[PDB]
Design an enzyme around this catalytic site. Structure first.
Site, PDB file in Angstrom:
ATOM      1  N   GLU A  99       0.780  -1.232   0.000  1.00  0.00           N
ATOM      2  CA  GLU A  99       0.000   0.000   0.000  1.00  0.00           C
ATOM      3  C   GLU A  99       0.804   1.268   0.000  1.00  0.00           C
ATOM      4  OE1 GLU A  99      -3.073   0.002  -0.646  1.00  0.00           O
ATOM      5  OE2 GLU A  99      -3.835  -1.959   0.006  1.00  0.00           O
ATOM      6  N   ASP A 103      -6.225   6.460  -5.278  1.00  0.00           N
ATOM      7  CA  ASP A 103      -5.704   5.088  -5.325  1.00  0.00           C
ATOM      8  C   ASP A 103      -5.731   4.652  -6.796  1.00  0.00           C
ATOM      9  OD1 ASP A 103      -8.350   4.243  -5.944  1.00  0.00           O
ATOM     10  OD2 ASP A 103      -8.536   3.032  -4.171  1.00  0.00           O
TER      11      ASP A 103
END
Length: 164
Positions: free
Chosen positions: A11, A20
């Site tokens: 991440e 994202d």
């Protein structure tokens, strides 16, 4: 290696609101704020999550707090899900981490979508699961991360995560 280190590799860490891989507003270590197009909506979710007026920026400790919550919630989600719990209970510790990583990324509902693959994992047919997992939007959209998680299911070791 453990679930925390694994997810921090997958991440990253960013202390300002960012979008994202799907274009959704996110902060910290993959903490999804909202699917809304509005940056104001995301700032308002952020403030509500942290309990202060953040103006879109958080500290490292705040990011790690969100991360701790999010991993605990993914673990508790698996354990209350009737489809996922029997799979998780069948797995060794390393493979459990791979299942947590998938739930963290795509949610309970999205993972319960992989029922063919889950049935192969529960039966311990690792090579066959790994092939079936790859026939997915997930693999096609985030192939490098999917390959690390799939390798971890195939082998039951942390080899995909050493050297990076």
């Amino acid at each position: 290696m453990n679930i925390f280190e694994m997810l921090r590799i997958d991440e990253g860490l960013r202390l300002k609101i960012y979008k994202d891989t799907e274009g959704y507003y996110t902060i910290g270590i993959g903490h999804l704020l909202t699917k809304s197009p509005s940056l104001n909506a995301a700032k308002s979710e952020l403030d509500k999550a942290i309990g202060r007026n953040t103006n879109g920026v958080i500290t490292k400790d705040e990011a790690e707090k969100l991360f701790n919550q999010d991993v605990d919630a993914a673990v508790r989600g698996i354990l209350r899900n009737a489809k996922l719990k029997p799979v998780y209970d069948s797995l060794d510790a390393v493979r459990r981490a791979a299942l947590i990583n998938m739930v963290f990324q795509m949610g309970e509902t999205g993972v319960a979508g992989f029922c063919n693959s889950l049935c192969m994992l529960q039966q311990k047919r690792w090579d066959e699961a790994a092939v079936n997992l790859a026939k997915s939007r997930w693999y096609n959209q985030t192939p490098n991360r999917a390959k690390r998680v799939i390798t971890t299911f195939r082998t039951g070791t942390w080899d995909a995560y050493k050297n990076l």
